[PDB]
Each structure stands twice: as C-alpha cells, then as structure tokens.
Design a protein around this ligand. Structure first.
Ligand SMILES: Nc1ncnc2c1ncn2[C@@H]1O[C@H](COP(=O)(O)OP(=O)(O)OP(O)(O)=S)[C@@H](O)[C@H]1O
Ligand SMILES: Nc1ncnc2c1ncn2[C@@H]1O[C@H](COP(=O)(O)OP(=O)(O)OP(O)(O)=S)[C@@H](O)[C@H]1O
Ligand SMILES: Nc1ncnc2c1ncn2[C@@H]1O[C@H](COP(=O)(O)OP(=O)(O)OP(O)(O)=S)[C@@H](O)[C@H]1O
Ligand SMILES: Nc1ncnc2c1ncn2[C@@H]1O[C@H](COP(=O)(O)OP(=O)(O)OP(O)(O)=S)[C@@H](O)[C@H]1O
Ligand SMILES: Nc1ncnc2c1ncn2[C@@H]1O[C@H](COP(=O)(O)OP(=O)(O)OP(O)(O)=S)[C@@H](O)[C@H]1O
Ligand SMILES: Nc1ncnc2c1ncn2[C@@H]1O[C@H](COP(=O)(O)OP(=O)(O)OP(O)(O)=S)[C@@H](O)[C@H]1O
Lengths: 290, 290, 290, 290, 290, 290
C-alpha cells in the first residue's frame, strides 16, 4: 500500500519477508541473557510503542551495534530479532550504496531512509558495517565522502524527530576499525560473547535436541573438549560426528549386511572421535600458520 | 505414468535415460576424495531418504555447485553422479529458458520445476550456469528479469517445502562471474581440482588400463612431464601416442612387410615423444599468445 | 575504392549507408545538453581533424561509452551521431565475432579494425557491449580468451598511432556488468539520462510536432502524469492515444454516419485516457511482479 | 489495365481473385482481439490511406509476421485479411523464386515487387517464410545469395519510398528458424495463439452454428475435454462426431427401417464419444512416439 | 547375398559401386594433412577392425563431418574415401527421406540403417546435411518431427552396440545452420580448408600433371594470382586457358595454314591471360553485387 | 626467458611494458624537488646497483610510500618512475589477491614475490594500498588474515636477503587508514604536495607548453585564481578554456563565415572565464555540501 519512487521500489526489493524466515527465539541458546536484554530494550518499544512514550527516555535506541568474534551467532540473532520483532527488516548490504557510476547514489541513500520512515516501525541492518563506507576508487572517493555526509545527516534526522519509530542496527567481526563517527553513534551496544562452559553445554543441547541420540551421552566432557571452538565450529563438529556415523554405516552395509535400514545412534565415542578430528583440522590450520 | 502439460512434455524430452548413459564410479579417477564427499552427501539421502529425516539437517543440500578449471572432469562427474544416483536427471541447457518470442517462457520455467517436483527424487543440472541468466536483447531484457525472479522464487519454494526431494546442480569454468544471488544460494560447493602428481598417475593408470601396454612402462616420469596438462589434455596425450604408434605401424607395413597384423605395444619412448609433441602444440598456442 | 580481403568484404557488408539512414539532429529532443557535448567532442575532430591537431590533447577520445536505462534513446543517438558525423559507421553486433567453429575468427577480429583503419575517419559501435565478450561453450572458451586478447591489443594499437582517426563506441543497459578491462578503457562517458519534467515536455512536443493536434492541449499535466515512463514508453503512450481515437472514429463511422472522412483531433482527454490505460498496463506488469 | 513484362504476367497469374475467395470476418472466431488489432493496423491505412498520412507514423507497417502453432488458423486469417482488405493479394509460394536453371530468377524477383508497386494498394504474403530463402544445391547456392540480397534490397526500397502503399506478410510454424535479417525486419508481429477455454467455446459455437444441433448440448464440458486440441483438431473432432452419427444412421436404416430419411441430431453423447476417439488417435500418435 | 525388404531393395539401389568410381588418393592434392588424418582415423579401423578393438577407444568415430567453403573439394574427398575405404557407401540424398505422402517414410528411415547394419563395414553419407531434416509443408511437419526422432534414435542405436561397424558422414557449405542435435553428435570434424600458396601450387601441379605443358612454366606467380580463387575455380581457370589456346589454334588453322595438326603448348602467357579473364568474370559478379 | 608456473604466468600478464608507457621526466612539473629525491634514492641503486653496495646502507629502501591529496599526480609519478627506472614494474591492483573461492590465493601471493624475485631489478606497486588487505566477507576473513601474514612474511624475506634487488611501492589518498603494520614498514616516504604559487605556474607552463597560446598571456594571475584547485583540476580548467574557445569558434563559423579554418588563440580572457566557470562548478559542489 506504500507509494514508491524507482529508488524506493529498489529498496523494497531488499526488504525481507516475515513469512519465509525460519529462526525464532526457540532456536537460539547460549546467549539468553543478551537475548533478554535485546528483547526488552528493542522489541518492547517496537511492538507497543505508545506504552513507552510517557518518558523522555527508554525510547528505542537510535542505534544498536552487535560486536563479537566470528561464528558467535551475530547473523543468527540479527535474523531472529528481525522475525520476532514482527516489524519490517531491511538488509542493507554494501553494494546497495557503492554505486560506482550513477549520481543515482544520492537519491538512493535518501530512499533507504525514506522507505524506512514510511514503514513504521522498521529496523535497518548493516552486516560488516565496518566496510559500509570504505570502498574507494578513482570514481568513488568524492562520492564516498558525499555518501558519508548524507548517511550521518539522515541519521541525525532520525534523531531529530521525536516521533521517529525506526532503528538502525549493525554487526561486525573486527569492530575496532569502525570510524569514530560510528563510535560516537550507536549508543546501546550488545556483546555477542563466545559460549562459556555452561553456555557451550546449552549450545550442544540445542543442536542435539532433534538429532538421534542415545540418552547415556555425557556432554560436559564434550563441553570441555569443545572449549577451544566457536559456535559455528560447534555446529560443524556435530556435523563431522553425524557424517562419520553415516560413513561407517554405509561401509558396514555394503558387505552383504541385511537391509534393516537402521543406523547406530549418536554415542559418546562418536563425538570424541569427531572432536579429535576437528582439533586435527585446527592443527592443520595452525601448522599452516607455523 | 506422470501426467504432463505441453510444457512438461517438452521438459520430459530433455530428461536423460539411465539405460543409455555409460560412465560409472568404476570409470573415474584422480578425484576419489571429492568423489567420496559427493557420494556421501548427495547420493545417500537421495536413495534412501527416509533414513536421514530424523534430523533437521544433513537433509540433501538445496544446491550443489561444481567449480574447477576446464578439462578437470566436471561434465564427466555430472554424468557419473546422474547415472549412479539412480534418480532422474534433467540437463537444463540455456536454450530451454531463453525463449525469445513466446510468453510461453513463464510457464516453461514453471514446468521445469513442476516436472522435477513430480519426479521425486530427481536432480536438476545447469552446465555453464554463469551464462544461465545473462543473454540479452531488445526482446529479452524484461523477460530476462522475469525469468530471474521466477527461478529464484521457485528455488525458494523448493527450500520452503520440508518434504522436498529434488536437488539442483551446476557447473562452470569461470565461476567468479556468477551472480551474487547464486553465490548466496548453492550452499555446498565441491572443487574439481586439477590432478596432482599422484592423481595424475592415477589418471594415466585409468586411461591405460585397457590399452595395449608393455609392463615395463614407468609412469611417474610421465606424471612429471604431464604436470602442465589438464585431464582432458592427458587423455589427448595418450591419444597422440596411440595414433603415433598406428602411423609408424602402417608406414612399416606398406613396404612389403608380412601380413602378421600385430602392432608395437605402448612403450615409454612412445609416450615420451607424444608428450614432447603435445608440449609443442602448447608451445604453438603460446607463440600465438606471444 | 578500398582493397579488401574476404574478411574485409565480410565487414564491408555490415557497414551502414549514410543515404538510407533517417534520424538527424532535427529528430532528437530531451538530451540537447548531452547532444551538445557529444557533438562538440566527437564530431568536430572527426570532420575537420587537422584543425585540432595542434594540441597533445582534445584529440578525439579513444573510446566513447553511452550508458542509460532502457528506452532512453541510446540506439537513436547512436544512429543520429553516425549519420550526422558524415563518416563511416560499422555496427558490430556480437555474432560478428562469436565464430563457433572457424579459426577464421582471429583474422576476422583483425579485419574489423583493418577496415576501420583503412576507412579514415570511421566509428565502430557495439550495442549490448556487455555481452560482447561473454558467450561461452565447449568450443568457445579458449577462443573467447583469444578474442579478448586480440581486441584489447588492437585497441592499444589504435591508441599507439598518433595519426589514428577512428573511434570506438558502445552502448549498454546494465553497464555495471562491464569487464574491468572495458572500465579502464573508454575514457569519455556520456549519460543518456531519463527525461526530466522539462525534458519530458520537450519529448512530447517533438512527438506531437507533426501529429494532428488541437492547439488547446496542455502538456505539462501530461508531463507530470508521464513522469513514471521512459522515452520509448512516452512514444508508445502517444501511440495508444492515437489508436484510441482511430478506434472511436471507426466505431462511430459504421453506424450510418456520413462519409466525410475526418477524425477528431488530438485533445487533452484523449491523452488522459491513454495515459491511464498505459499506467494500467504498467499495473498489470506490477501485479505479475507481485 | 496494367502493363506487364513476361515476368509480371507470370506474377499476375499467382494473384488471387477477390470474387472466388470465401472466408470473411463473419467466419472467424477465437482470435477477435488479434482480429481487431490486425484490422485496425493493417486494413484501415490500406483502404483510405490519405486519412492516415498526416503523421510520420501509423503508416502501414513495412512488415507483418504471423506466428503461432500449426492448426491455429494462420492461413485462414491470411485469406480473411486478403479478402476483407479489398486490395490485391499475391501468394508467393517458394517455387516462385527457387528457379534452379534460369538467370530469369533475378528479373523474376524484381518483377514480384514491380507488380506489387504497380498495384497500389496490395499485400505480399509468404507462407512457410522460414523456408523462403533456404533451398540449396550445386546450382543454387550462389543464386540463393543473390536472391537474398535482391529481396532485402527491394524491401529497403519499399521502406525508402514514403509514398509506398504495399505491405509484405508472412506466416510460419517454427519461426525461431527465421534468419536474423528477417528478425530485424517485420516490425509488427501478431501472435496467433491457441484458443483458451472461452476461445475454444467460441470456436465450437462457430463450427456448430450451422450444423444440426439439439439445443440441450452443453459445450463448456466439451471445451475442457478439447483443451488438448488445436483449432484444426477441433474442426476434425466435430468431423468425427458428425460422421459417427451418419454411420449409426446408415447401419440402422439398412435393417428394414422405414424410409423417413431423418437423422439423429447432434447430442452431447455424440461429441463425448467423438472426443474420446480423437484422444485415442492422439494416443496412437503418442505410442508411436513412445 | 543380402536378404532385403522392398525398403532395403530401394536403399540397395542408391548404393554406389566400387568398380565404377574413378577418383583415388592419387587424384587429390592440397589437403594431404587432412587426407592423412581422415585415412588414419576412418579407413584403418574400417579395413582391419579387429586390430583396433583392444581399446575402449580409437574405435571408428560414430560421426564424421566435413566442413569447408564451396569448391574446396568436399564431394571429391567423400568419393575418394568411399572408393579407397573399399567398404560399401550409401549416398543418402534428401529426397530419400522427404516422402511427402506415404507412411512408408518410417519404415524407409528404418531400412536405411537396417541395410547399413547388414552391410558391415559400410559408410553413410549425407551431402547438404543442413537441409537433411528441414523441408516443411502442410503434409510434412509432423512427419518431419517423426523423421527427426527416428534418425537420432537409430543413431543412438548405432552408438549403443559396441560391435557396430558402420559410420555416418556428412558435408555442408553453411554448417552453422546445423541443428544443435547434429552439433552434439558428429564428434570428429575435419576442416576442408582452402588451398594456401603452397597448397595452391600443389593443386596446379595436380591439374597440369597430364596436360600438354612447356617445362618453362612458372607456377608460383600463378599461385599468387590465383590466391583469390577456390579449387573448383582453379580447375575452371585451367579450363579457360586450355580453351583459349584451342580457340587461337582453330582461328589460325582456317587461314590456309598447313594441316600439321599440332597445338601451341601451355605457356605462362596463356595462364596469365586466362587468369585475367577469370578475374574479369569475378569482377562481373562483383559489379552485379555492387 | 623466465620459467613460470601458472601463478607466475598470471602475474606476468599484469607486468607493464616499457615500450607502451608514455610519460617521462620531461612530462612532469611542480614536484621537481621530490622528483630529484625519488630519482636519486630509488633509480640510482636500481640501474647500477653494484655501485652502491660498498655500504651497509643507501641500499635501495625496502619500501617507498607516496602520500598526497587526490589529483596531486601520484599515479603520474608512479608511471614516470616505472618507465624512467627502466626496470620491470608490476601493477598489483587489489583484485589480484582477493581471490574469494580458490585456495589458489596462497600460491598466488607467493607467486607475486616469486616473479618479482626472478626479475631483478623490479618494482612492485600497490595503488590504493589502504584497501589492499581490508576486503571482508563470510568466505574471506580467515583468508584475509592468511593473506596478511603471508605478505608481511614475504616482505620480511625481501628484507632478509642482503642480495635482494626488488622494491615495493604504494600510493593512497587517505593514508591515515593504513594498518600499523604498514606504518612500521615503508621507511622512506615522499609527500606529493599540492602545487604552490610558483609550482602552480610551472604546472600551467607544462600544460600550455604545446597548446596554441598568444605570447601576451599572463599566468601568475591565473596562478592566484587557480590556487584553490588541484593539479587534475588545473588540467581540467585548461580543458574548459580550450573547449570554450572551440564552442565560440563553431558558433561563429556557422553564420555564413568564410571557410578559413583558423581559431582564436588562447588569451587571458579565455582562462579568466574558464576559471570562473570552474569555480562555479566547485560552488555547485559546495551548495550540494551546504
Ligand atoms: N548461540 C547459538 N545458537 C545457535 N546457533 C548458533 C549460535 N552461535 C552460533 N550459531 C551458528 O552459527 C551460524 C553462523 O554463524 P554466525 O555467527 O551467525 O555468523 P557470523 O556472525 O556472521 O560470522 P561471520 O564471520 O560474520 S560470516 C549458524 O549456522 C548458527 O546455527
Ligand atoms: N579425473 C578424470 N577421470 C577420467 N576422465 C577425466 C578426468 N578428468 C577429465 N577427464 C576427461 O575429460 C573429458 C572432458 O572434460 P570435462 O572436464 O569433463 O568437461 P568440462 O569440465 O565441461 O570442460 P569444459 O571446458 O566445461 S567443456 C572426458 O573425456 C574425461 O574422460
Ligand atoms: N530523447 C528522445 N528523442 C526521441 N526519441 C526518443 C528519445 N528517447 C527515446 N526515444 C525513442 O526510443 C526508441 C527506442 O529506444 P532506445 O532507447 O533508442 O533503444 P535502446 O536504448 O536500445 O533500448 P534497449 O533496451 O537497449 S533495445 C525510438 O523509437 C525513439 O524514438
Ligand atoms: N479460430 C479459428 N476459426 C476458424 N477456423 C479455424 C480457426 N483456427 C483454426 N481453424 C481451422 O484451421 C484450418 C487450417 O488450419 P490453419 O491453422 O489455418 O492452417 P496453418 O496455420 O497453415 O497450419 P499449417 O501447419 O501451417 S498447414 C481451417 O480449416 C480453419 O477452419
Ligand atoms: N584439392 C583438390 N584436389 C583436386 N580437385 C579438387 C580439389 N579441390 C577442389 N577440387 C575440384 O573441385 C570439384 C568440385 O568441387 P567440390 O568442392 O568437390 O564440390 P562441393 O564441395 O560439393 O561444392 P558444393 O558447393 O557443395 S556443390 C572437382 O571437380 C575437383 O576436381
Ligand atoms: N605535477 C603534475 N604534472 C603533470 N600532471 C599532473 C601533475 N599533478 C597532477 N597531474 C595530472 O593529474 C592526473 C591524474 O591525477 P593523479 O594525481 O596522477 O591521480 P591520483 O593521484 O591517483 O588521484 P586519485 O584520487 O588517487 S585517482 C594526470 O592527468 C596528470 O596530468
């Protein structure tokens, strides 16, 4: 029902659909405290905004930054917040603004915020935000400065309107590189920390929850052996274990075994061997370093 | 037994026949690790799908991409997987979709996936996938955009149905050209690497396996001298050697030699000379470059 | 009077004739500033070259690229420049170089520039230049690389000769796809922009100039209502209006009306209804998108 | 009253007679929108040309191409336009130009257009236009090239004369085969589409209009059952039904029935059985395919 | 001794006789490298097939295509291979399959391959192969599709039988027109190139070999002056020279010259004048083009 | 004569040719002191290295960095040094290393320095060096770290070998962004400063040196009025002046002026007006800022 210019139709294409996203609060673990903080601060003003207006403050923050090591679940939480918020979420990947030839860039940068302002409430997200305004070339440097100026001016415009309903969000793996202008902005900042021992156990429980598992698995030992890994690496370790079991099954089946079609369930030794091989992969990477 | 529209009958024509294909796992070498990975990941869920459903994951990937230099055996492995999988394989060459005149295009793009969905399990393949959605003309640009949108929408539809049984596959020689939409899709990606020294020796063994060969041939030297070549070039080098032997035989026979009808077997010097001439052909190409 | 090889006779066939082309400077509107820039920079050195040689610079650019959305008049301006320049113009459509079988390709790529160099001054044009060197197949990839190398080498040859008199030109609808080699070449680049409100009014004046029009038509309202369209769509909108008037005339004539043979002139309501129906067609396209 | 050379008298023989043609606008159905477009664009300028000259444009198109699957009524509409236009219509079947021996060919190709130009207004038609310039032999290839060059040159001549009054038309079943030269020509192109459900019902109404029919026939069911057919096949299905009724009549009459000489009128069951047998014929063709 | 159906007797009529063919390897020049390749690849497996079976490969190719400009000797080499191979050669001119009325077509297409399979080894040839499956008419289109399907199915049947001994061959002047199905077939392809300077000298030597020639003729100059011609044109140029000498002889004899009955031998000036007149004929053709 | 791996052949393609570069010491002005420093320090050890080895020091620096505002001539001086040095110059644009998919990256980074080490003496250059090791993505971050480590390790390797003959060079517009690792490297650093009043006058003299100029031009006033510009802007200002003169010439010629074909020479008022218009362009940019 929104009225659009060619620019705003271009932005409308990047808008995500809440009916095709998958992840939810039920599909996240190991961050539940940060989950609680993010939910309470961001989602609550978004969903029922009029409730929180009787205050100069606790108005939804004009900037949210997620910072944490790679593989800690930053993109996962971005998607989960986008879906669970129930609002409109724009994924503003860098190519959207680094228009190398067209003066169309200025109106396009304007149109991003224009569509966001039309669609109230809505959330803007920038993955790899450190790279957002850095690309340079003979045709881009002056245009890069113009894009910088326009983006901060429109951000200040969002700040200026007391009736604004839109938030801007970002993620990054090496956040120190962020420009001082960003550092002065993005007031509220949430650390997506690596999972501790208990958090690692929670992560393993979430992953294994709908795997085929023998009840007598003990995970805390797996939690210790996995302490060197990140969340994505935890996922990939459960991967190596499952595929290892599948390999041994297929190799045993070929030797004239009966066609029962049933597999050995996940057992402690499986994850032990998988973790050893995962550490071997890390060791290959380290030898490449050494 | 399938019920078809004119579109689906048109697609049914492109469907390959598992009774006329030749190549098998017994006719591939130098990639056995990638062969193992492809087999385990793709074929196993395809053949006995119900076995792998007790998991949110290890479900057959929604996209498989093969990337490797020309002549490394990408088409060979595509055919080998198609036959060995035992499923239905559709070869979706570009002309199938670049309908330049008929609005029939939309229904045809729909019918490809329609037939694939009817035929469960089945695999879709696109050779030269980089060129799949690039052809342009005065009558094609808008239709090209429509085809793009429809193909990704139907791909998302395959993703949406948890009961989907169909995979889509692609190959390409210059894969960097691939559109970012493809890059975001095709999660699992297998590198068809060039044969290393040991892999090259394996390739030569496979080729010579049913040639007429003197046992005292030594190949590792041939492996080193062939290191500059690709697999197709290895094949063509064995070609030049065999034909060279045939030429010398016929020239010796004409000079009043007895009609014994027996040829000199493959010997080291034959492949040495053939490889030298092959490098001479490469040198002619290089001089054309220079 | 030129001496030709079979290749150069093949190229000579594609050469356009300045006596059968139609469009002129008198038949172009809405771009007059870009028209002025193109005329001054390109045509002036072409026609009276010796005038501009007393300078290391302002020599005709070694590459001209036209970039603008579809329907903005890129082909029209290409033809207009070709005719008005009075020089020889070669339309180098892609099929000229994508010779799929003959080694004739190399000599053919050479012959294009050979004929251009013989015919001084002359202009080379490549519509859909992005597709110029992209077509690929089992028989084409290596030949594609050879064609690439030859074309840039001959372009560098044109650059090398200070007495060169030939220009190369190109057009494209999605120019970002252009190879970085092209981006490094084609120094002077002209944007064929969409018509603004005043430019749109000029376009409508040009189209209606020799239509049958009632003087009391007001166009600025038509200019606003047409702002969503492109130039080709402006042309097609005047189309729908004229044909609508013809339809109502023929339907009124059949009902025993006198045989006066005179039609209702173009009036505001005609274009209003035609524009509404044109927007309805755009709406049908949008619903197909939605 | 025209003055003729032997060539032009030969062409004059192929000219059709508007007093012996049968079909009219009253004898066509299922295409009425395409009928309207063709009528408005082609016939109106033809009949009262001076009316449309006060425009650079909407002048009768220099080429009309009809493309549609076999049996969709392309020849029928060609004849209907020829008669209803009231102009002179030349049926230029391929043999007219593939003169295998006589240098008479050149003057004959000239004479076709010569007679057309003398006879203003007139329409040239080429059925199976894809085959028009393809026949080859030891005595024909060079002559084939000459014929190609002459035909496009004379077509360009028709384009050149602003006072030209003649149109050229063509039809084809596999139009993709058309040479790129044709594709660049023939600007206006009309799709003779297959009849949709409503169009199929209209076709059946047209066919049955002057058959002997019981009023309680219901056709929409026949329309659905006939959806697999083409227009010619619809005609042939009404054929099988009528002849089936005649067969049962004659077989019932021979058994000492009274000589009343009256037949069972067309009823639903008749067309049901006829359509079943028609689908059986299609099934025999399919089994031949299978 | 073969057992035949009416169809196979009809095909047996087209079979050529190795005792009435003329041309041989001793009567071909200017292609000796392509001659060597064709001989080695085709003839050797044909004549002594059991010699080459100890290999999955170097089995006679399932398709040979000859492509080259008109007059380069394609038919000559076809005949030479047919005779020198010593096998049975079938000349499958297009009329053999374009049966316009009889359902006999299907069995006839079957019978071609049936006789070929009975007669082992044998070679099938199709001149003007591009026209092989293109002829169309109201009575032919569906039959054309049936013929296409049958021919590729029987070709696949030849591919399927590892004991097959028959080859299929084709020639064409404009081979790009070939259907993609053919392009996917016919693996081995030999280019019948135009004669280069040395090849042209060889051609002239072959032609003059048994003419009456003065030893002091120099041909390399004739080779340069003839470079614009093709092989057939070289033959026809030697023609014009010989007939020119005969004309001058007869004109000198009539003027009361003695009845010695001896002619001036071929000398340089004769071929010089003949080549000038030949170029004059080419010039007349060019002026017709211009 | 160098022996190359596929990687080193890929690098060999980027190597520039000293026979096609244009600029020289004779084509640079306004930096002659920095020119002298660069020449003495870099070129002298490069050309006659054995002369400078009798010292632990004044060995060619292991890193040269050029830093200056955009348009000050950094690329010009890079090219001038590359040509005048007479050595081999590699232009290492960022895409060479940001290989997004292939493990080929590691060997490619090695091959850059490998070819440089083989080709002694040679100079490596990185334009936009700040962006050299910054690009990031899901597939690049770990590879980015690996590339960083490899590049500094190979740089340390160049430092380690006392017989090293290769230099590495870089340029950048916003050099503060440079990583601290770079800051610790690149010992010798040359500032490409903006032209002062005298330097600006020298720049104008260089540009006008082979323009058509009236001797009574006074430049110091032009030098003051141009003080706000950069070198590229100085060039573009001389541009606007020359083109302005050409425009007035062409407009005066059309009005029935005699065909003398002579233009008004460059005069003070021309540059005055051109500079005013240039400042107007700067003012438009400023208003966009404001
Ligand atoms: N706490 C968690 N709960 C569930 N999944 C997690 C968690 N942490 C990480 N993951 C997994 O990590 C994956 C991807 O890693 P992410 O950290 O979300 O991506 P990322 O943060 O963008 O890393 P990069 O380097 O920026 S691409 C998903 O497949 C998640 O399942
Ligand atoms: N590992 C291998 N084992 C057996 N044959 C191989 C192998 N690698 C390459 N080949 C041969 O390579 C051939 C064709 O090369 P492919 O790499 O399969 O085709 P391709 O990948 O499509 O190359 P292009 O450039 O895309 S056509 C076949 O004849 C194979 O026998
Ligand atoms: N400024 C203009 N003045 C006159 N005609 C114009 C103008 N802009 C567009 N047109 C019309 O646009 C037509 C064709 O559109 P073009 O833009 O020239 O073709 P194009 O740029 O090649 O578009 P594509 O997508 O590349 S085929 C012609 O019929 C012109 O009359
Ligand atoms: N819409 C229609 N109205 C009336 N008759 C139709 C219609 N469509 C097809 N026909 C019948 O179709 C017949 C012949 O088919 P056509 O399509 O006109 O011939 P065609 O297009 O040349 O087919 P081919 O394959 O080219 S011979 C005539 O007998 C018509 O009566
Ligand atoms: N290398 C050659 N050696 C001998 N005769 C040749 C040679 N090349 C061409 N000819 C002559 O060319 C003749 C006929 O030309 P061909 O090329 O064999 O026929 P073609 O290839 O079918 O041409 P078309 O256009 O297809 S009929 C014969 O009379 C040959 O003597
Ligand atoms: N001192 C100078 N002498 C001659 N030409 C100069 C001088 N300074 C700048 N230029 C001109 O400046 C041009 C390009 O500007 P450069 O400064 O060399 O490029 P640059 O340093 O890469 O700028 P960017 O922003 O990095 S693309 C060339 O056309 C030179 O002619």
């Amino acid at each position: 029902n929104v009225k659009l210019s060619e620019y705003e139709m271009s932005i409308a294409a990047h808008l995500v659909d809440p009916l095709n996203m998958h992840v939810t609060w039920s599909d996240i673990a190991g961050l539940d405290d940060v989950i609680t903080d993010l939910k309470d601060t961001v989602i609550l003003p978004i969903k029922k905004k009029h409730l929180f207006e009787n205050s100069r403050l606790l108005q939804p923050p004009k900037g949210v930054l997620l910072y944490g090591p790679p593989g800690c679940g930053k993109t996962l939480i971005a998607k989960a917040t986008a879906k669970e918020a129930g609002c409109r979420f724009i994924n503003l990947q860098p190519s959207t603004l680094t228009d190398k030839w067209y003066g169309e860039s200025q109106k396009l940068a304007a149109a991003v915020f224009s569509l966001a302002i039309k669609l109230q409430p809505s959330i803007i997200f920038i993955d790899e935000i450190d790279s957002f305004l850095r690309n340079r070339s003979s045709s881009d440097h002056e245009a890069t400065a113009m894009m910088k100026a326009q983006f901060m001016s429109l951000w200040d415009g969002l700040d200026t309107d007391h009736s604004c309903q839109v938030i801007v969000m970002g993620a990054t793996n090496r956040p120190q590189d962020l420009d001082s202008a960003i550092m002065r902005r993005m007031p509220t900042r949430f650390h997506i920390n690596q999972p501790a021992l208990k958090q690692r156990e929670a992560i393993l429980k979430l992953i294994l929850k709908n795997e085929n598992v023998d009840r007598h698995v003990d995970l805390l030992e797996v939690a210790q052996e996995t302490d060197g890994f990140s969340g994505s690496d935890l996922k990939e370790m459960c991967r190596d274990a499952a595929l290892l079991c599948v390999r041994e099954y297929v190799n045993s089946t070929s030797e004239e075994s009966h066609d029962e079609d049933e597999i050995r369930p996940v057992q402690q030794q499986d994850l032990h061997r998988a973790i050893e091989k995962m550490k071997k992969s890390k060791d290959a990477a380290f030898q490449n370093v050494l």
